[PDB]
Each structure stands twice: as C-alpha cells, then as structure tokens.
Design a protein around this ligand. Sequence first.
Ligand SMILES: Nc1ncnc2c1ncn2[C@@H]1O[C@H](COP(=O)(O)OP(=O)(O)O)[C@@H](O)[C@H]1O
Ligand SMILES: Nc1ncnc2c1ncn2[C@@H]1O[C@H](COP(=O)(O)OP(=O)(O)O)[C@@H](O)[C@H]1O
Ligand SMILES: Nc1ncnc2c1ncn2[C@@H]1O[C@H](COP(=O)(O)OP(=O)(O)O)[C@@H](O)[C@H]1O
Ligand SMILES: Nc1ncnc2c1ncn2[C@@H]1O[C@H](COP(=O)(O)OP(=O)(O)O)[C@@H](O)[C@H]1O
Lengths: 459, 438, 439, 441, 142
Amino acid sequence: ISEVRGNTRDHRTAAHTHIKGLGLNSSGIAEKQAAGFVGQCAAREACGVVVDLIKAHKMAGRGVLLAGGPGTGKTALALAISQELGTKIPFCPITGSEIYSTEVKKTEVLMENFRRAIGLRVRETKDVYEGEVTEMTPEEAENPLGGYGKTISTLLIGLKSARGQKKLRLDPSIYEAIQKERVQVGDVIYIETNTGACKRVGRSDAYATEFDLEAEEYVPIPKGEVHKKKEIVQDVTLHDLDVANARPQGGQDIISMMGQLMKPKMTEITDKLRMEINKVVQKYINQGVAELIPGVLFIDEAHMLDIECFTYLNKALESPIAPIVVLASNRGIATIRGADDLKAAHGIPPDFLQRLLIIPTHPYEPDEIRRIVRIRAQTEGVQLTDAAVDRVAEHGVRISLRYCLQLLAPASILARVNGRTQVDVQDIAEAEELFLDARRSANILTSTGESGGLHGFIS
Amino acid sequence: HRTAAHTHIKGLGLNSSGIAEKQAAGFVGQCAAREACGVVVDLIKAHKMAGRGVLLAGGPGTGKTALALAISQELGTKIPFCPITGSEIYSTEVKKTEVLMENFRRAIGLRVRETKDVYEGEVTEMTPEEASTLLIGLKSARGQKKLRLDPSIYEAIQKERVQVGDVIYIETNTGACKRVGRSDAYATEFDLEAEEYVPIPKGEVHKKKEIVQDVTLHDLDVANARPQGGQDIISMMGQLMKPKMTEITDKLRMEINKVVQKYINQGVAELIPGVLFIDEAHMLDIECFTYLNKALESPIAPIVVLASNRGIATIRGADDLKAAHGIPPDFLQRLLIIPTHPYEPDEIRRIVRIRAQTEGVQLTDAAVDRVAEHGVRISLRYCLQLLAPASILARVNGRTQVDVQDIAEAEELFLDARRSANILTSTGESGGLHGFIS
Amino acid sequence: GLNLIAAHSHIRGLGVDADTLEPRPSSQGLVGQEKARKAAAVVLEMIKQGKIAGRAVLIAGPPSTGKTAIAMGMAQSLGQDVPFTTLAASEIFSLEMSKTEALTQAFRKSIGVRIKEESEIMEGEVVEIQIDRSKQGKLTIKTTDMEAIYDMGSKMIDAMTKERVMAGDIISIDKSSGKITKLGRSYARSRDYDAMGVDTKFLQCPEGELQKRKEVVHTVSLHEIDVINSRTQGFLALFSGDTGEIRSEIRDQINTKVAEWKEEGKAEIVPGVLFIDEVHMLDIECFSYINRALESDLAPIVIMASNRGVSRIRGTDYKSPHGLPLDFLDRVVIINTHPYTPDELRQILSIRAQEEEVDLTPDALALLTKIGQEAGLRYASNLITTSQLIAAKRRAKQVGVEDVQRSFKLFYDPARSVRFVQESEKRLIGNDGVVDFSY
Amino acid sequence: LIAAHSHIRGLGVDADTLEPRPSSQGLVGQEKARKAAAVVLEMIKQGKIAGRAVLIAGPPSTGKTAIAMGMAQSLGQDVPFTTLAASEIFSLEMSKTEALTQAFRKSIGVRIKEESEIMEGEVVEIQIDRSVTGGAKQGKLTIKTTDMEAIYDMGSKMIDAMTKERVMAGDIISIDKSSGKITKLGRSYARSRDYDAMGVDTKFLQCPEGELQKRKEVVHTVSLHEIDVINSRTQGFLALFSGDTGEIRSEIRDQINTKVAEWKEEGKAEIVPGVLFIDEVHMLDIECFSYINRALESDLAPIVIMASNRGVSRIRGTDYKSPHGLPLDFLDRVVIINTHPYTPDELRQILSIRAQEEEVDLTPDALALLTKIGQEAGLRYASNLITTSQLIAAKRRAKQVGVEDVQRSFKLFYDPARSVRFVQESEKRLIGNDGVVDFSY
Amino acid sequence: RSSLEGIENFTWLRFVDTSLQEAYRASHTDVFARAVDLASKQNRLGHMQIVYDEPEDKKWTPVHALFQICERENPKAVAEITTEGVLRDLMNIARVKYRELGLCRLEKAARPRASAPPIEVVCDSRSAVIERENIMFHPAMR
Ligand SMILES: Nc1ncnc2c1ncn2[C@@H]1O[C@H](COP(=O)(O)OP(=O)(O)O)[C@@H](O)[C@H]1O
Ligand SMILES: Nc1ncnc2c1ncn2[C@@H]1O[C@H](COP(=O)(O)OP(=O)(O)O)[C@@H](O)[C@H]1O
Ligand SMILES: Nc1ncnc2c1ncn2[C@@H]1O[C@H](COP(=O)(O)OP(=O)(O)O)[C@@H](O)[C@H]1O
Ligand SMILES: Nc1ncnc2c1ncn2[C@@H]1O[C@H](COP(=O)(O)OP(=O)(O)O)[C@@H](O)[C@H]1O
C-alpha cells in the first residue's frame, strides 16, 4: 500500500544537538570539555549532584534554580540533565508562559505538569490465547437438560498462529461472546483468561480472495505463539491516572459517547481525587507491584510565572509525592510578574527563593567561545578554515555566542554555491553582512527613526 | 413609510461625466467627496480589484454616513453592502479577528439563477411503485398530474404526514415539500376532527418561476462548518449544544473557495464582490488594524470603506501611540483618504428644506430661517431634530404648517447639549440636595 | 476567476539566479532590495535543504519596503511542495485557546509528513444487484468502457442494503477498507424521475477500468495528525476550529510515532516555514514561549517581519528595538529592507500597472513616480486603479497625466491627510473628546 | 519519599497540661506558639464552638506550616483537615466566593452509619439464563456454608457482577447485599482440568461456617460539600472528583443544612466539624476577606487557621497596606499566633531531625558547620545541604558526611543572600527591569 | 473526491479510518445522531494492541487507520487484559470510592422545590401540532 522510501535516514540539527550529557568523571568532577560542553565546570558538577539526587528515590519536592544571563547555557544544562536521566525517568519541560491556559485556572495547569513529571511503572502479566479460528465444534453433553433437546458440555475451538496451532477446549458460556461478536471460521480472535470471553480483530487475510467484493478489511494471522503469557511493563504518569479517573473513556451511554465526540475540555481535578490516587498508588508500591519513579519538572523562563503560581508551588512542593522542580531564570532584579509593588532577585519572590538550590551560570571566555564554535561547526556538518573559526569566535566575543552559531549555516550555503567544500573568511565576511545582529540593526533604527517621516520606522 | 436620518439620500447625484451636481439626489455640497465616492463605486462595479481600502475622514455631522449609504444605493441591491461599527467586533464568542473574517465574507456575494418547478395540489393518488419509487397524483381546480417520485423525495413526502386528500406543496428540483393542509372536500369526513381544512388550489397544478438567489461566502462557511437548521435538533438543549460561532479555519475557507470556483466554471454561479463598511473605525484596536493589514492582501477581500471623525487621537490598545484619525500610520498608508468638510450656512438651509419635505413637514420662510440659524450656531443635527416636534406643536394648534411660534416652542422644550451643559454648570455648582451628581 | 488582483499578485517568485543566489535588478516581479533578496534566497536554500531546524529570521524595515513582498516571493519560490504557514500575530490572541497553544499549533502546521500510497478503488455505475438466500449475491457494474459481474459477500450485501444502492447509482468501493460510498446517480437517469430529493446529484459515468491502482502522494501537517487524534472525529475540527488546548501527551505520542515512520521509511518529514507578520504584536509571553519552541528538532524555520523602531514591548512598559525583547532578538538574525530609489519606484509602478492591465502614458508614469517619491509607494500604486477608472469615465484610450492629477486631487495621501487633521482639529473629536459642531 | 515536613508527627505537647516539650514529635521550640496551637487543637476536638479564625504569623520559615502540619497529624484521619493554598481560589469555573464556600463545606464531615448485610459462602451451583439479542437476564445462585444451603434469585445487575467476577462453583464469595458488590475470597474445590482459559488457581479456603446472612454495621464519613454536589444534580456525580461542579445554588445548601440537622436529631448522622487551613492567606482579595468574615458566623462554619509571612503589606485588590496584608476589620475577628525565628541550638536540633529523617550520618563537625550555615544562610538552605552532602559523600564512598562534603556542597550551591550578591555583581549581564542587557564579553 | 491527493484539504482522509460516506454523514448528522452511530462500532484498533505485539508483528496497523495513533497505542486496552488488575483498579479509583462511600444509596438531602414541563408555542394550526410531536417527543432520539 504505502511505497516505502529506501533513502538513507539522517537527523535534523537544533541549537542543542551537540549536547550529549554533563561530561563528568566517575568522581563527578567536570571534564574541561566533554559531551559537547565547554566550561561551566561548576554548573555541570552541581547538575551532576542534582542528577544523582533525582536517581536517588529519597528526593521529594526539592527545588533548583539555574541562575545566569541569557546565553549562559541554562537550557543546555537542563537538557543535559534530561539526557543523563534518559527516557525511563520523566522529564517534563514547560515555560512559565504555558501556564496561562484559558481553559482551567493556572494552578491546575501547573499541577498537571507537576504530576506529569511523576511516573509510575506497573508490572502485570498478559495471558491470552490468540489465532485464526480454524474450527468451532460443540461437544454434546453426557446429561442433557430436560425440555431443551440441545445441551453442549464443551465448545472446542481451533486457533492457528504463524508459529503453531492448538485445539482449545472452552467453557460453553463463550457462545455468548461468539454470537455477539459474530466470530466465524477464518476470523482472528483472542481469548483472555481473566474473563473467558473473546474479541474479534478481523478476518484473516488468508481469506482476502473469498469474494470479488466483501465489506471488511482483512488482518494478518498473529505472528506470535498461539498462547501468550508475558510480563508487560507499562509506563504511566500520575497525570494519566488523574485524567483516566476524572474522564472515563469507554462509557457506552449516550452522554459518554456524546462527550467523546466533543472537545476533551480540561477540568480542575480535585485534591480529593489526587489524594485518593496517591493512597492507592502507595498501597501498590507497598505490595511491590509498582515502582514510583519521580522525574523532573523543568520550568524555563520561570520569571514568567506570577506570585500566585509561586505561592501554589509552596503547597505543591510540600506534597509527599512530587517531582524535583528545576527553574531557569535570567531576570536580574526585577518586578514580580503579579506583584507590581515587589521587586526581587531572579524575579523570584524571596519567600520562595529560600527553598531553591541556586546554581549560577557564568559568562564564557574568548577561548571557550572558540571551542564552542568548533563543536557547533562539526555538528551542523560545516567545516571551517582556522581563520574562519577565529573570525566567528571574534564576533562571539564582540556580539554574542548565539549570533555566531547562527552564522555557520548561512556561510556554508554561500560557500557551496561558490563551489567551495569548506567555508572561509570570505564567506563569514559575507554572511555577517547579509545577516545583521541586534545591535547593528538597532543602530539603523536609532539613525533612521530619529523622527517621524515618510520612510521612518514607526514608534 | 418611516423617515430615518438618511432617507432623503437617494444616491451620489453625479453627472454622466462623474462630476457632482451641487445639489442632487438629496445631497447638498460635499461635491469633491461625492465625486471621490463615485470613483469608489466604479472600482466596486468593475469587480477587478480585491481589498482596496478607503477612508472617509472629517468632523462629526459632515455627512460621512450619508456618503457611505449613497454608495450602497449606487451599487443597488445586487452588490452586497455589509455595514458594521468598529465596536461590533468585540464578540464574546470568538476572537475579533474571526469576526472581521466573517464580515469580509459577508461582503462577497454569490448569485445563482434557479428555476423552481412547483407542484401544488390535492393528493388524488399515492401509489408505491416498488418494494423504492412512489407515484403521486396531484389535482388542482384546473386538472390533475401524475409524478414519479425518487425514494428520497418519497420519504420526505412520507416524513411529513401526507395522505390522500391532503393538499401539498412540492418543489421539484430542490426536493422541498410541505403539507398545506387537508382538502375541504373532506371537511365533513367527521363532524369534529383536529384537522385543518383548506380549499383546493385554484390555479395551475404546475408552476415554473425563475428566482435569482443570492448567497454570500459566509453563508457557505456557516453551512459547511456545522450542521444547520433541522440537521441539528439537539441544539434545542442550549448550553454546549447551541450553534455557537467557532474560529473557522482558513483550510475550510480555502476549500470553500475551491468548490465555489468549480460552480463558477460550470457557469451556475456568478461571483459578486462588494463592500464592507466600518463606521467608527477608531473603535478598532491595534490588533484589528494589524489583522486588516494582512486580510486586505488576500485575493478575495472586498473593498473596505472606513469612517473616522477623530483628530490626532490615541489608537485603542496602544495608548503609547497617537495618530491621525486614530488609525495607525502603518495602516493609513494603505487607504485612499476622502476628506469631508463642514457645511456653509446656505448649505444648511438647503439640507433643512430637503429633510422638511422628506418628513412631510412644511415651513414658512421665517421658519426655515430660524431652523437654519440653529443649524449654523449650534449643530445641523440639532436643527433637523426640531422639525418633527414643531410639526406636532403646529398640529395641536390646528395649523397646517410649522411657523416661528412652533419652532420657538420646540427649541425651548428640547434643548441642545450646549445649553444643557450650561444648566449643568450653573446647577451642579455644588453637591447640594438639588445638585447633579459629579 | 475567483482570484481578483491583489497587492502581491505580481510577485511570482524570489527572482534570483538558482546557481549563485545572486539577485538580478528585476525579475519575477521584484525590484531592488538586492541584499534582502539575496539573504532571503540564502534562507530559502536552508529551508529547502531542511536539516537546519528552528532558525529565526527577522525582516526589518520601514513601511512599504517589500518585507511582505519578499515573504510572498519566498513562498512562491519555495513552491507548493513545502508547508508555508502565514500567521498574523493578531491571530494568536484566541478566545478558544491559550496563546502558547495557538503558537504551538502554528508551529505544528509548518512540519509536513509525506506519505506515498497505492490503493485499489473500484468505481462505476451499478447496473444490477442480484441476491440469493437459502447469503450471497452478484453485482453488475459498468464504466463507459467495461461491464463486469462481481460476487458480493454477505457483509457487502448488508452494506449495499444499509446505503440504499439502486441501479443507475454511481458507487465507489475502496477495496482496502471494503467500505462502499455512493457518489450519486448517472446523469443518464436524469429522466428516470419527475421529482428528486434534496440529497441527490447527477454525475458522468466513470471512465476506463473499473478498479484502478493509482499512486498518490500525501503530505499532512503535524497539526492535522494532532487534531485528528484530539477526539473521536477530530478531523471535523480541522474545518470548524472547535478544538481545545490539546493535551501535550497526545503530541508526545504523535512525535514518537512520526519518528518511527521516518525510521521505517513509511514517511518523509518535510520541515517548512512559519511566517509571523507584524511579530511586534506578540507579547512578552509569546516571545518567551517561542524561545523554547525554536529549540526543538521539529521546529520550522520562522520568518518574521516588523516595521517598529524602538518601541514598547506589549505586555510590559519598557521599550526595545523592533518592539521585541533583547532576550528574543539574541536568537534572531535580521534582514534589513531599505527605501526605494525613484528608478526602482518607476519599475514597481510599471509592474503594478501591467498586473492591473492599465496602460500608462509615459508622462503619467513619470508623474506617478514623483508622487511615489513625494507621497509613498502604496499611494501612487493606488492612484493607478483610480486613474484607470477616471480615464474610463472619459472613455480615454490611455491613462493621461490629467487622469492621475484628478486622482491626486480627489484622494489625499497620508501626509496631506495629517495636515488636514491638524488644520481642522477643533472640528474633529480630540483625544480629550472636545469638539465644536458649530460653524 | 521524604518531604519538607515528613518528620513532623504531632504537636509535641503534654496532652494533660498542654505544656510544650522543648523537643518531641519532631517539633522544636516555638513553645508559646505550640501551646497556643494546642489550645486551638483542643477546641477543634471539642467541636462545641464554630467559626474561630486563628492566624499564625511570623517571618519565613519559623515553622508556621510545620505547626499546622503538626496539628493535622494530631487530629488523625477522622477529623477533616482541608489544606488550601489561597491561590487555589481564583478558579475559572467558579467565582472566588463559590470556591471559598466549597472549601468551608469540605471541612465539615457528616459521619453516617448504616447496617449493611453480607453473605459469605461456597458457591455450589450457578444458573444463568440470557435472552438472545440481549436485554433480560435471569439466574439462580446456590450458595453454601458448613451449616446452610440456599438458592437465591439473581437480577441483571447481580449477574453482570457475577460474570465480571467470573464466579464459578467451588468459589468462596462474599456479597454485600446492600451495595451489591462481590468479592471472591478463594476456592474450596480444586481448579478443574476439563477446560482451558479458566485463569488463576486462586487461594484455597475452607468453607465458611455459620449462617449465610450476617448484618454488618458500617460507618461512612462524607463532607457537606459531597452532599451538596450529588444533591444539586441528577447525574454526573463524578463532579465529586473531576471538579466539574459549577456554582451550586444556595437553595440546595439551605435544604442540605436543614436536613443534616434533622439527620443529627434522628441520630442518623454525627456532624464532625474540622479545620480549614488557608496557607498564604495574604493572597486573597478584599472580596474574599469580606466573604470569610461573614461565612465564619454560621453554625456550620469550620475552624479556620491561616498563615502569613507578610509585614505591613498591600492588600490585594485595593490601593492600601495593612498588617499581614489582611484587612483590619478581618483581623478584628482573628486571634493571632506569632512564631519566632530559631536560636542556634534550636537550629541544631531541627537539623539533627532532618538528618535522621533522611537517614544521613552527619559527623559532629559537619552538624556544627551546618548549624553555622543555618544561622547565616537559613534553615531551609542548611537542610538542602544535608541531602546534597550525602550524595557528594557517596561519590567519595565516605561512610559519614564529613566537613569536606558540607564545604563542597556549600561551594556548589548558593544560598539566597549569596545569589543576591551574585545578581548584583552581574547586573550588566542579567536582564534588568529595564529589559536592557549586554551579551558581549 | 476532487480534493483527495497531495496538498489538497482532504489528503488525510485516506489515513483517517472514515470513508467519504462516513465523513459526509458525520458532517451532516448532529452530535446525538453521530453518538448513536458510535454505539454500533467495534474498537478493533484496541484489540490489535493485544495481538500485534511482537517485533515480527511490527506493531501492525491497517494503513487506512495509520493516523489513529492514540487508538492503536493506549494503556486502557492492555490494563483490561492483564490478570493482575493493578492499573485497571488505578483507573477506576473515582468510580469505586464514590460507590464505596454509599453516596449512591444515601437519601437525597435536597430536591428542586418546583418542577415544570417545557414552555411550548401555542399556534392554531395542525402543522404546529405535528411539529411539536416531531421535536418535543422526537421518535428517533426516544
Ligand atoms: N557550556 C556550553 N558548552 C557548549 N555549548 C553551549 C554551552 N553553553 C551554551 N551553549 C550553547 O549556546 C547556546 C546558548 O545557550 P542557552 O542554553 O540557549 O542559553 P540560555 O541559558 O540563556 O538559554 C545554545 O545553543 C547552547 O546549546
Ligand atoms: N451633504 C449632505 N446633504 C444633505 N444631507 C446631509 C448631508 N450630509 C449630512 N446630511 C444629513 O445630516 C445628517 C448628519 O450627517 P452624518 O452623515 O450623520 O454625519 P457623520 O456620519 O459624518 O457624523 C445625516 O444623517 C444626513 O441625513
Ligand atoms: N521590490 C518590490 N518589487 C515589486 N513590488 C514591491 C516591492 N516591494 C514592495 N512592493 C509592493 O508594494 C506594496 C507594499 O509593499 P509591502 O511589502 O506589502 O509593504 P511592507 O513593506 O509594509 O511589507 C505591495 O503591493 C508590494 O507588492
Ligand atoms: N520547630 C520546627 N521543628 C521541626 N522542623 C521545623 C520547625 N520549624 C521549621 N521546620 C522545618 O523547616 C522547614 C521550613 O519550615 P516551614 O514550617 O515550612 O516554614 P513556614 O512557616 O515559612 O512555612 C520545613 O521543612 C519544616 O519542616
């Protein structure tokens, strides 16, 4: 049906594709450049302890602040933390701007993400019989019931898979499932042993040629064993348990079915539900059938949170089940987003800041900027003459790190369209002239928009 | 008929050459502004151009809304004229940029010439032909007719409770049908029944008439966005179920444009782009003008006429920015601007006479003089509002016409805002027991 | 047709040498702006090569300096093959969803998933249905060119019954799903009935082979897959809007599966462009979200335009260049568009007159170029349409200077209008509401 | 997990004299405030008096939440203790007034008793009859003790339960006849062998003894809010949990107040009034305070406890300041408890409890240094360094947290005051309140 | 059918499981009528999640249902088949405890003091009486 593309796979490169980890010794000391990082040895070592905090299940509701100017690698450090944890531990990134939902109060939006950052791992065994129905045969009973004339003591079903077939002897009550489900010979079904009922996947595509037209799609014969008994490990967040309880999905009545045909509007999940969910979760943890695996809620531009968000986070972080929260901020001393009379450092209320482990991120030396240019070039696949490297690094000292990382691809285009397989000073000197930085542009504004005028900028 | 404010404005009063006649079609003066509006009429009727903006700019009471309603009458009923105020767009249902989109598409018309074959008659026979087809016999006072009915129109006839002896209306092409009633030939089938008995149709059982139907692109949006009318009965519940406006995607509007052009290529439909007129455009905010700027670049957009009476004023939603007309200078560059100037005393006299005979009031010459004096010294709108009260006062004095006595009484029963402000200044001097509330 | 003449109809591409990316002084409708067009062409190269995710490019310049025109030319030169979401910043202030959802959706619109499929569809006019019970049946279908008899299964006869298929109907059967559709009835049956129901339409009979195996390419936005998974029939929300603040865990699943499709080669990911016009109408909460949004593998390249000088950012009270946060501007590279020389205006006004099919006399085009210098490009452009209509009112063959002069007399430019507002300030509603209506 | 207050296990007072011990049940110091909270705690337990607003006041830290969490532990599970953050009240689904009304009514329990009746026996036989094409079902259960057999007729709801539970002969089951729920307890027979897919060979049990029926007195506690939600509705009682409930009409509450009083007079219910704790109470608006002040005056009002960090501070939603940021005519109705910042030996004792709760073996010099840090950086920061130094010690495989680990932790992680200096030392490179910044070196 | 390929606005309809007839029905029937249609359908993509598990099964999905990702991958289906009902119970907490609290059996503490039938149009015509019966006593909904 679909025409599979045989062409080679490759990965897009984004602003942080070069970062692969925190780059630490087994002693936890930062290597001066490793895993894509250059410098920030203090902040990487601190994040390494935070990583070991998260992997140790004693933590609940601790707070971290990544504090430092724009460009200083706070986003890179958060992503590196996430990569050090890996996919088995939740990392839930948001900005403060995402909390201003129109659809529920923002303390609900934040508590959703707070519970998204908390994972639950449940182990259960799946136990089914599974195949194409090869036969159905009633076993007439030894002692029939009077007045009925028919009495069946067993129904026998043949199931085949790709890997075998079995004669299956079933309690005759399965007649109810077969008759409702309209199971026929050549249909693919499974029998689940916790009910003894059956469900029909479809007709086996071995029968796809029975007619010139039949109104169903066929399905392949199951490629497993005819009997499955498997442990299954389910990734669950506690937010999944919130929604699954607060809006049940499978309801067969008109109001349920009309509900599932209309937009699944968020609702202000009660603390009573969440607190009972916690109690049943803690029960199953004590049974040992589930693991709690708290992860990371990361809030970037946390200075976009307002004082109502921060005061709720006080209560939230005090929960006995809670992720770690990592905050990033760049806002100096600034007015609290929802308390116009109050200024504080980082734009974080002094009440709340006292809870956080602050990690400072510092600027970069000229030689670190150069090393970052080397790492970024080989990641985007660009290759530079050393004089192009030094010119890119020089703009990085004079203007900004980000601006210079953004010159690499434009200059690579200009090089290849000039027939050069590597970029040189002539291309950098050309990329930097097509693509201005904010300062040179602001100078054009300041010179041209000194007044109103037919060709003036507008203000 | 009733006499509203503009009912004397019959059109722009332009010469064959497009020059304005100094008094024609119920205008006086504004000749340069009427001539400019004439070119806007030509621009619209050519239907070549999308999305040209026009601004009418000038003091209150200088006729900016007379001019926009004169255009509407130069265009005639065929071309869609969609008037709104800039304050109408602050809907609670959807973002105001969606409300602008809906009004742009109300300004674009689509004309279909449909032939309707109507059969109206007493049901003389109903013979199910298949076991799908029905045959129905219909009778008027002037003959009977058999019809072969598709199972679809049959079940419509059968969903209505039509029986032999009923009188029905059928539209042959549309598939619409109605039970008009029970034929009164059966009126004595019982002495009482809960039934409505109607005479047999006395004309032809068959009629053919051609109706030039008009829709708009917004009508096509609404019909395609959600089930409408009898398709959605559960709408009767209200709350979640009522037919709320939703923020239509431009995927839908682009796909509607595709289908509509198909029927234009078949020659079934005629496209008629028209006008969106926004009065009090200074009530639009910076986000609206930011949207209008893009939306006027779409290939379908109507001609937009704006009116404003503001001087240099802050734009709404950005008090930091003051601009002429209250229109952002960014957007003002896009508009053809027509200035409207104040009227001379002699022009005020002529407008008073025009509206007097439009209200059916008749005046002595000195009665025209005194009203015109109030037009010059106070306001044109005030002096015209004197005419109707003075006619009542003259009537109850038994006089056939308004005279100075009846205006000198009207002007003292009904003060202008200026003398009223003087009363407020003299009486609200303090917060005393008989003072006005500050 | 239904496309009327618009402001950017003459813009037919970006107008550069495909080899060197060197622009030429005019082509494809664009004139001048050479460095900005060369920069736009360099951005278009990395859009088409696609590997560079999430770059942001600001087109900055005065009014009427071709920022939107260059964005149109880039979209034309990019072709239909790649997504090009065009968003006014005003559109993000939705009442039905949060601003960050509205920005998320626009980001999701700009990444295409491309799939190629072949599937068997049988289409034709029904000639007869025959049924036996003792369930089985036979179906006769014709095209203009074939007739054949097909055995129908029991479920297929039920589907025919449920959908009231008669002889003379046109039906389609997708053999992959097995589902029938009724397209209408053959126009040959136009005389079969006297009256027809509202839901009935006639068609030409299908042509050629009864069952066809066309190969078709499909490109869908990530936003479409989201809205399809939003709810049980979410595809209807693609048209009515009618969608919530979609849960992030749905998008998390969709991104993971689209990666599987790219690994398995079932699909090709086609990253496109989001163009945010008037990006200075965003607020401090939009910009801070966009920072994180850009920093992801599935982020498009984002183009944006501003005409603001040093101006206050919305949602705050400090000013900044372009009206944008410096925290945001650090992530951006800026393309600057300049004013136009009279010779570039002369060219653009000729291109507009051709697109508007207006025959300017040389003197009219000269005078119109003076107006463009004295009163701006858009005003002189708008006088072209006006002078054509005025010339037509005198039945003139060509637009003369007298038709441009009368156009200039009748319609004020912005500067002459601002002068009129200053001259009559007492007759107009001031910023403090004062006005005098008297003579 | 270990949370901020997980060591707090009570109020630490002598139940006879209400004398605070200097350290017990995890609380330390605050003796005046702990005695005051113990008098409040006693008049909570006594139930007699309604609508007392007690404000706990103090600087940040100094245990105001810790005291309120100590109170909650000392009440146990039975008395309602509704924790509310004042920022929860600004719902989009309901007004602040309605959100406060619900928070009050969540804090009053109705403790309702019923005599359930239960069956427990071996299933000897099951018969089920089913209508083809659905609809009606019928059946009989034959169920056994050592001492009885009886045949019970079954309806559709019970047959649904029986088949969902996959009840079979030889199962031991119990049936709560009042709710209709079934639980399989085990099996007396072996699991058969004639059929496949029978599932789990559940626990063996001997047959139940005695009579099949037994009465069972059971007691359930429900809030006045939970009675409100299900009595304002015909359908959709999940609004107890999803929070979909709108602004409930006052006619429903007036009826419920009347009927719950009558249920108390009938002896059907005990009213168990509990606590509403409004933390961060300074975050409420003037409109909220002018609701609480009169909501307190009702006979069903809970005892309302509050905490505030604020000094003379602006009241939200108005132009002026007041003590605690709370209106004066509100504070008129409040008795105020003041908490006081800890001494170094109090800091040392708290940090020892935090260390023991986290199971961290501090060396004595590390506890001394953490105390010195506690005096100057704060108790929360000095607490954060305990778990951090434990991790650093584990990197070097140290069996105890040494001074080197606390110094290493102090180096890596800044306290608030040091971070404020770091901000002041980098005002050029951080984003200012003017939005200006310099990105260059 | 004229918009079913490439970049055209129904391109996705091949991979949403609806046919052109189903799409046309769902766009014209109201939410109640569409919900009645849902009552007939089988959640077959949830059963596929039980069967097409293994690497050999490639997590198979019918290509015409390719975009129903969240129906093909959903814990709700798996939790109902596993014999340790752990996640099954974690998803029913709210409905269980509501019932366990006896709130389903506790006497009503309030009811509306007044009750009324719907307001009706009164029109002296027979079509009005028919249309009342067709809407207010709607047979198909009923
Ligand atoms: N120490 C570092 N080593 C390597 N790359 C870095 C480092 N710090 C920042 N970068 C890169 O430079 C850019 C700026 O860092 P970023 O984290 O975006 O700054 P901010 O913390 O202000 O968001 C990003 O693309 C990031 O990947
Ligand atoms: N040029 C004119 N000739 C005749 N009557 C006019 C003229 N201009 C205005 N009027 C009448 O005077 C009234 C006031 O003008 P109007 O258009 O309402 O002013 P504006 O809309 O600019 O505030 C109009 O309703 C109209 O009836
Ligand atoms: N280089 C150019 N060549 C041809 N036409 C242009 C050029 N620049 C602008 N125009 C036209 O002039 C008008 C204004 O330019 P536009 O880019 O829309 O304004 P802005 O600079 O505000 O984006 C449009 O009709 C546009 O098509
Ligand atoms: N007297 C105390 N005894 C034990 N732990 C305390 C005491 N006071 C404060 N703490 C602990 O210090 C931290 C801050 O105290 P907390 O009560 O949250 O302060 P606040 O009153 O500002 O909320 C908490 O982890 C708490 O357990």
